[PDB]
Amino acid sequence: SMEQVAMELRLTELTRLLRSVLDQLQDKDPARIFAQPVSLKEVPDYLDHIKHPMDFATMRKRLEAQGYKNLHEFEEDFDLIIDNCMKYNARDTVFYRAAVRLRDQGGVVLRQARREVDSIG
Incomplete structure (x- = not known):
């Protein structure tokens, strides 16, 4: 159908915006603390602590498969990165502090993206 294609053009443009x-x-x-999955070779107990791991490479794979239906699902994954870190690592660590700074700095980007997604439809 002609609609399914119109739909696919929006999903593609949403993917474009989310990229x-x-x-x-x-x-x-900039430290790339959240770039890749936490290594289960190097933290073998990780899944006993964190049930839904996330990282920026994993989000990228989902994105390029057009696996994000809306901005909300995307935010869910971003929030996992931050919240998993803030649980596994203690407050006085470079990792926890990195998560706080990413949360704070990302808020601004996400604020405008929500306006752009509502605005462009």
Whole structure:
């Protein structure tokens, strides 16, 4: 159908918007603390602590498969990165502090992306 294609053009454009959003969020992690999954070879007990791991490479794979239906699902994954870190790591660690700074700095990007998604439809 002609509609399914119109739909696919919007999903593709949403993917396009979310890609720029992801790049902007990832720039706020210059240390690359959140770039890749926590290694289960190096933290073998990780899944006993964190039940839904997330990281920026995993979000990117989902994004490029057009696996994000709306901005809300995308935010869910971003929030997992931050919240998992703030639980596993103590307050006085470089990792926890990195998560706080990503949360704070990402808020601004996400604020405008929500306006852009509502605005563009």
